[PDB]
Structure 1
Amino acid sequence: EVKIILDRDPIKTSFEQWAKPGHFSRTIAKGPDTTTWIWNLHADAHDFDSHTSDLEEISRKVFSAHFGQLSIIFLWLSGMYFHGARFSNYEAWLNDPTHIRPSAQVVWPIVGQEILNGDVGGGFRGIQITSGFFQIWRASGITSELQLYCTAIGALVFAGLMLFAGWFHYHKAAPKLAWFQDVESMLNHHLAGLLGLGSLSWAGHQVHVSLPINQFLNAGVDPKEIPLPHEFILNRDLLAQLYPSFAEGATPFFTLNWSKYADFLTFRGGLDPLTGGLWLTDIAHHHLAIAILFLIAGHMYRTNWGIGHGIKDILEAHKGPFTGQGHKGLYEILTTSWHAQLSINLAMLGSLTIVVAQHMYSMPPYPYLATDYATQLSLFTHHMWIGGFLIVGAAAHAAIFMVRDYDPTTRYNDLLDRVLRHRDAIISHLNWVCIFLGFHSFGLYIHNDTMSALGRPQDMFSDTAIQLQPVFAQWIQNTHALAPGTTAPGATASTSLTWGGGDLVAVGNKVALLPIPLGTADFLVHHIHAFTIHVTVLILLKGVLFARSSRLIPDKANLGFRFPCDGPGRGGTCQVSAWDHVFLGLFWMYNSISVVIFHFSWKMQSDVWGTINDQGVVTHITTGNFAQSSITINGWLRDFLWAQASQVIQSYGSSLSAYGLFFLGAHFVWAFSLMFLFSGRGYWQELIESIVWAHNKLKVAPATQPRALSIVQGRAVGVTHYLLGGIATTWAFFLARIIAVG
């Protein structure tokens, strides 16, 4: 076969269908008879494979939808750059980053809100931002508000192009099903074209704009005096005085004999003692390897020249004694089901966001990011939630595939088979591990609480009594310390300062990073992590494996992916559906992530962040109480929650009172969720009966018959507010705390 560009001519464009609500569904396009109609309209709006059964049409819908998504992201980026141009103190912050608070939002003087425009420094009144954009912009060598303004226009223009493309590829030239399926092609391009050229491109701006300008900023020269980026490209003299390797052209690269380029590219590693961020000389070099690597990787798959790989070939040839003919037929499944692809992608993109958070705190990439605790606590916590959510979404679509696309008669797999043929063995074991982890992580805490309360500190699990020293993580930690020179001779300093041992970095009076200690307190929390994660996995995997059938419900697959139950029979069968497993898994992801970000916040303030003076004396924020008081639930209640929540409950009258409002505001919607979660629509519908009576009495009863929320929606509404309330509370709590104290 030969891969090519395939499209079709115009397929309609009119406001006619805008005027017709629920047009996409044949059931709902007839209009409402009850208020249920309205909710269904929004819940089935994006269910494309529920609209039609043609794979070509569904594929064309999701393709333009991605253009729509990108359009928004570009419009969203356009605003952040614009606000950094009109309503910000970036130019002020650019001179004194260590003392001036970054702010990019001014509030109108109505009703008394102007109080939120607090003293952020630089003779500026506004709201302190924790997005981190200031450190990105300084890293890109962005000097003036003009350049941020130009990027704002550039992003807005791109937003228009993205939006235009979506219309063009759904209404004008719609890609054919064969085009979407060319996966050997797409992977080649996304590997080489998007990632390879993308990383290559940024490696260029760095070694021409970022690296030159950043050196000036660090020398201490006034930002307004620093030559524009284009003065470095034109006159190579400027980029020759600093980084003299530029004296030659393509040589030595072209003549190989690498390199005299060690001058602006190196494997130094560690952290810049003056900026607190990763060496820009390393990052530029880093993107150089990433480019080439992905450019190499972009030539694995065979297309139109017989050289490369057929993915279908690779899979089929991977079969063992234990697994059967497994992997055979996976290519046809993954090229035929969107949900199958989305599940894998969510699981992986979500997992990636989580490693990003752990990598950006321990290896601070942007200049003056480490000592801005307000941002670092926000960035880590933000990615933890984003990654956390995306992972739960993988379970949902894995389940949807099982219900909707799974067909043994047409697209058998054998690997997917067998798994279903011992799903009780997998779930029963995962059940056991969770119970073991629960007792052996949380039970240790309850032990500690009881012994402490009985006045038996020596009978506790602690560093001063019965120690549970996490030696495996400690040994590794030590190994990365002895890594440079010994294992990796090219590396000058350690990978991270958490592995440094006897190295510390400070910017201003604040600590950027230092070796992070590990003790019994860290042992207990990690098993708590190991525990909470497994239970989340249990709920979701159980939902996927038993999505189709069960000893209780032989034909669950016929009931669909999202149904309330199958009645009170068989003892009761509420929340048997795969949807309800995602619903239940959502709470447990929340439970797990919440104790993760609390683990972060306390550990950093207690053992890492704090004030340092020029005598070496380090004074941490909470003063190193993590080791002796995080090993007790009462300790978490008192020394963590009670103690640190004082900032947000004492923020009224201050610039941080909005956090005080959102603190209580989020407690409200959280408790509000409990009305929906603890009750059933049977009561509410009967209550509405008495209320409907009153309206009929006064001739003001609506034709659209009011109905209580569906059983599933009641759960959807409940978990949504439980999440919004709980997460927003910690948000207000975190930001108020870290902005006031930090």
Structure 2
Amino acid sequence: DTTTWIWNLHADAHDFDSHTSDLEEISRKVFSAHFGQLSIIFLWLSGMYFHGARFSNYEAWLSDPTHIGPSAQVVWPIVGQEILNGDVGGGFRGIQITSGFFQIWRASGITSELQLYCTAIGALVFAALMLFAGWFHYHKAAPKLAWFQDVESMLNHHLAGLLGLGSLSWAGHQVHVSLPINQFLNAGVDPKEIPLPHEFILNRDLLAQLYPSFAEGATPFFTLNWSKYSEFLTFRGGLDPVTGGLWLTDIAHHHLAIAILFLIAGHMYRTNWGIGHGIKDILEAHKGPFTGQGHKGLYEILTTSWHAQLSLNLAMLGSLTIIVAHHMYSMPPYPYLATDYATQLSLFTHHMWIGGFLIVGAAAHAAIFMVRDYDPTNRYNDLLDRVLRHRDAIISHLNWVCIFLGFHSFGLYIHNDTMSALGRPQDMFSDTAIQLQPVFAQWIQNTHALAPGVTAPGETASTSLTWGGGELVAVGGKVALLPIPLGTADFLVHHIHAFTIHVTVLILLKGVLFARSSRLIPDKANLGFRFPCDGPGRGGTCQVSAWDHVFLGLFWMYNAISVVIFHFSWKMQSDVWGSISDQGVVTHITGGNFAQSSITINGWLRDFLWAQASQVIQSYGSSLSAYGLFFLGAHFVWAFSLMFLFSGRGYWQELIESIVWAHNKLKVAPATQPRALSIIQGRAVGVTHYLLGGIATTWAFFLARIIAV
């Protein structure tokens, strides 16, 4: 009839709760969708593993990791695009990759291209298996609802079996394959002369030569004489001098300990045999001193709703991803990763964006649960009611903190800028005039530096080299890691981070709390989770729904994450990364200008944005010209997004009316009447293009800058 049906078709494709009201069918559809996603992931992994076997310089890089740039993509010479095949070294031409796949393969003991082919074939087989399993479990043997609600058995298996046994199996693989092959590689042995991994298993004296403890067999494990296994199960700490990563023996010991702990932890919840706790009993019986009655009623809420569980899991996964991003740059786990700067910058930025998106999703699905599944009559919970009964106090206090933080974090920058402009450099907040030192962080750094030898007797070195007191590490003439100083410039940016995080939290929490009703629209629950407005009455009620709160919070998440990656990039380029001469003098890439230039807004515009963007804008005619082309294209998308965000719907409907008249004049009028986009759709289109343009611009800028220098 009209064109809005086409748009509505793709908008509700995965909303199973709207299609049917039966929990069993929703659960079955969710199971099959998960199977399909797993199949797609396996296909992606198969492609990645295959491409590195046929179209890569993996072997040449393996013979010389420092001086050869990794590559796994090659372009066809059709329209003159073969200029993208740069000289990456090793007698190979192609596109340099920054996903850190070569380091993973080297740390796993892979030495030839025959093993990658087998891995690719196995992954393809697994993808086919997952697709068939999804089809079978939806159409032939679909489980019942009572199967999905056995959350005591799901936790036991997902802790003991999935996580407990995976770590143990990986520790076994490491001990049996990764340690000896990496020891041979680190000894200067040519890769084609290293014995195959199965020779270590079949021939035992070969393993005994490298580690004498393997001659004793498995008897010391059973006799509790565990000190004999200290040859390959160490507690050293620090980085490997040869490669620049963590010792593989430490990783093996860590995985063994983690596996044992998870296996122990997986025997907690009660099952058919009557030993262990029940989750409902733990929730009900818990009554501390201020809760009073307790958490009575959360079991039904969390077992009869999919949106609450999705929100909780999304929040936890986002926080975990951010932690993973932070913990990998400071303690590099793979060989030849710290001194390869292109990959280090790319791995930190990827997971930050992923974590931010997942957190915003958690907020959105909490709002959806509040709008749809909330039921005070049948599923009453006390704590949620008390939180809903004083929501005015929560929001008003969170509103104040944002203003205070914003003033006391941005007015300092503005004051510095004004004092610099007026020729009064002695009145700025800097290391020379007025110092705001982060004393607590420095105390933490000193404590962590001094912890080995006093509070950690078994440790031979500190966990990381960022805490001041350690020694510089150099691999192949480049700087891998060294202590990171903290000063007045690091005091302001941390409070910028805090301010942005608090504002995002304010927006999302306000949306979630006022999803059901507010003082303006008492019946907002009946209008739905996703509705544009409630008319121009009461002065105007534009964007009152929770969907619009998530739409507003996406912008602030993007604003917050962008400052983090800029801070990381400039601080690492100016204070850590660099090169070392033969006599031991470190020359950083930008020569330590972060301390003095990063205290005014002019310093970020001139010393960071203007100075570091000269690489991308001069990439025309070289193998990096694709980054120069993507730099300009992303600006177009970002500026194109503004048409949907700034304008309304009536103007475009009238324009389409005139266009339809001109079409009717020539008997080319379609039977499907054209319609302008809805109010909600126009908002969704704008933010998508906005985020795409911004992220693509930053991506091209970073990748073109860091590969060249």
Q: TM-score, normalised by structure 1?
A: 0.95
2:226 and 2:482 map into 1 onto residues whose CA distance is 34
Corresponding residue SS for 1:444 = helix
Instruction: Judge conservation of contact 1:326–1:413 (CA < 8 Å) in 2.
Output: no
- Alignment deviations for residues 80-121 of structure 1 (CA, whole Å, 9 cap, x no partner): 100100110111100111110011000111111111111111
Q: Select the residue among 113, 136, 141 that pairs with 1:145.
A: 113
- Alignment deviations for residues 628-664 of structure 1 (CA, whole Å, 9 cap, x no partner): 1111111111111111111111111111111111111
Corresponding residue SS for 2:219 = coil
Residue 481 (structure 1) shift? 0.4
Corresponding residue SS for 2:587 = strand
Residue 710 (structure 1) shift? 1.1
Residue 583 (structure 1) shift? 0.6
- Alignment deviations for residues 264-313 of structure 1 (CA, whole Å, 9 cap, x no partner): 01111111111111111111111011101110110111111111111111
Structure 2 partner of 1:253:
221
Residue 502 (structure 1) shift? 3.4
1:446 and 1:478 map into 2 onto residues whose CA distance is 32
- Alignment deviations for residues 482-506 of structure 1 (CA, whole Å, 9 cap, x no partner): 1111111111111111015231111
Residue 415 (structure 1) shift? 1.1
Instruction: Judge conservation of contact 2:468–2:485 (CA < 8 Å) in 1.
Output: no
Corresponding residue SS for 2:238 = coil
Q: Please show how residues 318-397 of structure 1 align to structure 2 within 5 Å.
A: 318-397=286-365
1:274 and 1:321 map into 2 onto residues whose CA distance is 55
Residue 321 (structure 1) shift? 5.0
Residue 326 (structure 1) shift? 3.4
Q: Please show how residues 282-321 of structure 1 align to structure 2 within 5 Å.
A: 282-321=250-289
- Alignment deviations for residues 546-600 of structure 1 (CA, whole Å, 9 cap, x no partner): 0001001111111111111111111111111111111110000000000000011
Q: Select the residue among 61, 69, 77 that pairs with 1:93.
A: 61
2:153 and 2:556 map into 1 onto residues whose CA distance is 39
Residue 684 (structure 1) shift? 1.2
Structure 1 partner of 2:494:
526
2:8 and 2:120 map into 1 onto residues whose CA distance is 38
Instruction: Judge conservation of contact 2:649–2:677 (CA < 8 Å) in 1.
Output: yes
Instruction: Judge conservation of contact 1:362–1:497 (CA < 8 Å) in 2.
Output: yes
1:255 and 1:121 map into 2 onto residues whose CA distance is 53
- Alignment deviations for residues 150-173 of structure 1 (CA, whole Å, 9 cap, x no partner): 111111111111111111111111
1:115 and 1:501 map into 2 onto residues whose CA distance is 47
1:739 and 1:247 map into 2 onto residues whose CA distance is 47
Corresponding residue SS for 1:104 = strand
Corresponding residue SS for 1:237 = helix
Corresponding residue SS for 1:544 = helix
Instruction: Judge conservation of contact 1:494–1:500 (CA < 8 Å) in 2.
Output: no
1:320 and 1:704 map into 2 onto residues whose CA distance is 63
Q: TM-score, normalised by structure 2?
A: 0.99
Deviates more, 1:457-466 or 1:522-531: 457-466
Residue 262 (structure 1) shift? 1.1
Residue 731 (structure 1) shift? 0.2
Instruction: Judge conservation of contact 2:449–2:470 (CA < 8 Å) in 1.
Output: no
1:638 and 1:331 map into 2 onto residues whose CA distance is 56
Residue 669 (structure 1) shift? 0.4
Residue 251 (structure 1) shift? 2.2
1:454 and 1:112 map into 2 onto residues whose CA distance is 54
1:684 and 1:279 map into 2 onto residues whose CA distance is 63
2:92 and 2:164 map into 1 onto residues whose CA distance is 42
Corresponding residue SS for 2:480 = strand
Instruction: Judge conservation of contact 1:540–1:581 (CA < 8 Å) in 2.
Output: yes
1:149 and 1:470 map into 2 onto residues whose CA distance is 52
Instruction: Judge conservation of contact 2:269–2:278 (CA < 8 Å) in 1.
Output: yes
1:450 and 1:164 map into 2 onto residues whose CA distance is 67
Corresponding residue SS for 1:174 = coil
- Alignment deviations for residues 379-436 of structure 1 (CA, whole Å, 9 cap, x no partner): 0000000011000000000000000111011111111111111111111111111111
Residue 245 (structure 1) shift? 1.2
Instruction: Judge conservation of contact 1:324–1:414 (CA < 8 Å) in 2.
Output: no
Instruction: Judge conservation of contact 1:536–1:585 (CA < 8 Å) in 2.
Output: yes
Q: Please show how residues 618-637 of structure 1 align to structure 2 within 5 Å.
A: 618-637=586-605
Deviates more, 1:541-550 or 1:496-505: 496-505
Structure 2 partner of 1:719:
687
Structure 2 partner of 1:234:
202
2:152 and 2:359 map into 1 onto residues whose CA distance is 26
Corresponding residue SS for 2:540 = coil
1:471 and 1:693 map into 2 onto residues whose CA distance is 71
2:447 and 2:157 map into 1 onto residues whose CA distance is 38
Gaps of 5+ in 2: none
Q: Select the residue among 559, 562, 584 that pairs with 1:594.
A: 562
Instruction: Judge conservation of contact 1:347–1:390 (CA < 8 Å) in 2.
Output: yes
- Alignment deviations for residues 456-498 of structure 1 (CA, whole Å, 9 cap, x no partner): 2211111112111111111111111011111111111111110
- Alignment deviations for residues 604-624 of structure 1 (CA, whole Å, 9 cap, x no partner): 000011111221100111111
2:37 and 2:174 map into 1 onto residues whose CA distance is 28
2:290 and 2:9 map into 1 onto residues whose CA distance is 47
Corresponding residue SS for 1:439 = helix
Instruction: Judge conservation of contact 2:168–2:256 (CA < 8 Å) in 1.
Output: yes
Residue 322 (structure 1) shift? 3.3
Instruction: Judge conservation of contact 1:327–1:415 (CA < 8 Å) in 2.
Output: yes
Q: Select the residue among 378, 382, 387 that pairs with 1:419.
A: 387
2:633 and 2:640 map into 1 onto residues whose CA distance is 11
Gaps of 5+ in 1: 1-32
Instruction: Judge conservation of contact 1:245–1:261 (CA < 8 Å) in 2.
Output: yes
Structure 1 partner of 2:670:
702
2:428 and 2:645 map into 1 onto residues whose CA distance is 38
Corresponding residue SS for 2:204 = coil
Instruction: Judge conservation of contact 2:338–2:480 (CA < 8 Å) in 1.
Output: yes
Residue 316 (structure 1) shift? 1.3
Corresponding residue SS for 2:160 = helix
- Alignment deviations for residues 639-697 of structure 1 (CA, whole Å, 9 cap, x no partner): 11111111111111111111111111111101111111111112111111111111111
Instruction: Judge conservation of contact 1:302–1:308 (CA < 8 Å) in 2.
Output: yes
- Alignment deviations for residues 293-347 of structure 1 (CA, whole Å, 9 cap, x no partner): 1101101111111111111111112234533423111111111110000000000
Instruction: Judge conservation of contact 1:184–1:303 (CA < 8 Å) in 2.
Output: yes
Corresponding residue SS for 2:579 = strand
1:517 and 2:489 aligned: no
Instruction: Judge conservation of contact 1:132–1:375 (CA < 8 Å) in 2.
Output: yes
Name the CA shift for 1:500/1:153 in 2 (closer, same or farther; >3 Å).
Answer: farther
Instruction: Judge conservation of contact 2:2–2:672 (CA < 8 Å) in 1.
Output: yes
Structure 2 partner of 1:277:
245
Corresponding residue SS for 1:224 = helix
1:541 and 1:281 map into 2 onto residues whose CA distance is 45
- Alignment deviations for residues 499-541 of structure 1 (CA, whole Å, 9 cap, x no partner): 1523111111211111111111111111000010111111111
1:167 and 2:167 aligned: no
> Which structure has more helix as a fraction of its residues?
2
1:123 and 2:116 aligned: no
What count of residue pairs does the alignment treat as equivalent? Answer: 709
